[PDB]
Amino acid sequence: HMVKVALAGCPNVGKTSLFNALTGTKQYVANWPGVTVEKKEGVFTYKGYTINLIDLPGTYSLGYSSIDEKIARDYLLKGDADLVILVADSVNPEQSLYLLLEILEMEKKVILAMTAIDEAKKIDRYELQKHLGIPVVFTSSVTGEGLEELKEKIVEYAQ
């Protein structure tokens, strides 16, 4: 099967690192349609599923007026993605949780991928997940921690 998965997040939450760890060199850069804003897109396979991962511009809010947010908002409204992975900073999750509320308006199928889990130690996952009613995965792009659990969640939504 094919699955289209959008990666969303505020600026500086490790979204590029996570994108790179998932796609490796199987990615390429182009421009979003009609604008100069760069688009990264890539592919990986997991357990028979081919996943097209599209990196959305960083956004504090989908409602803002800059081109970055218009791009992300428009893409999420036109629900081409099958699900969304929201990349979130573990140390300071407030902005990510705000964005999550906005995204849930447009797409109910969301996975929360927490980053900076190593620094953070220096959150009860099951508790955060029970609260939110969506899967929450703790990831480290560097060690690969949590990436298997993330991909497993992608295929669960896909079905």
CATH number assigned to the domain comprising residue 46: 3.40.50.300
133 annotated ligand binder: no
The range of the structural domain enclosing residue 104 comes to 1-159
- What's the chain's length in residues? 159
Cβ–Cβ < 8 Å for 81, 6: yes
The verdict on whether residue 58 carries a ligand-binding annotation is: yes
To the question of whether residue 116 is assigned a binding role by annotation, the answer is: yes
Q: How many CB atoms lie within 10 A of CB 40?
A: 18
Establish whether 110 is an annotated binding residue: no
Q: Does the annotation flag 56 for ligand binding?
A: yes
- Is 11 marked as binding a ligand? yes
Experimental technique behind these coordinates: X-ray
> Beta strands of the chain (E only): which ranges?
2-9, 27-31, 38-46, 49-55, 83-89, 110-115, 136-138
Resolution (A): 1.9
Establish how many alpha carbons lie within 13 A of residue 42's alpha carbon, considering only the half-sphere containing its beta carbon.
Answer: 18
Residue type at position 121: K
The CA dihedral of 129, 6, 67, 105, to the nearest 10 degrees, is -50
The answer on whether 9 is annotated among ligand-binding residues is yes
Answer yes or no: is 24 a known binding residue.
yes
Structure tokens at 119: 């620094």
Q: How many Å apart are CA 45 and CA 18, to the nearest integer?
A: 15
59 is in an annotated binding site: no
Beta bridge partners of 113: 87, 137
Total tally of structural domains belonging to the chain: 1
The runs of H, that is alpha helices, within 1-159 are 15-23, 67-77, 94-106, 117-121, 125-132, 147-158
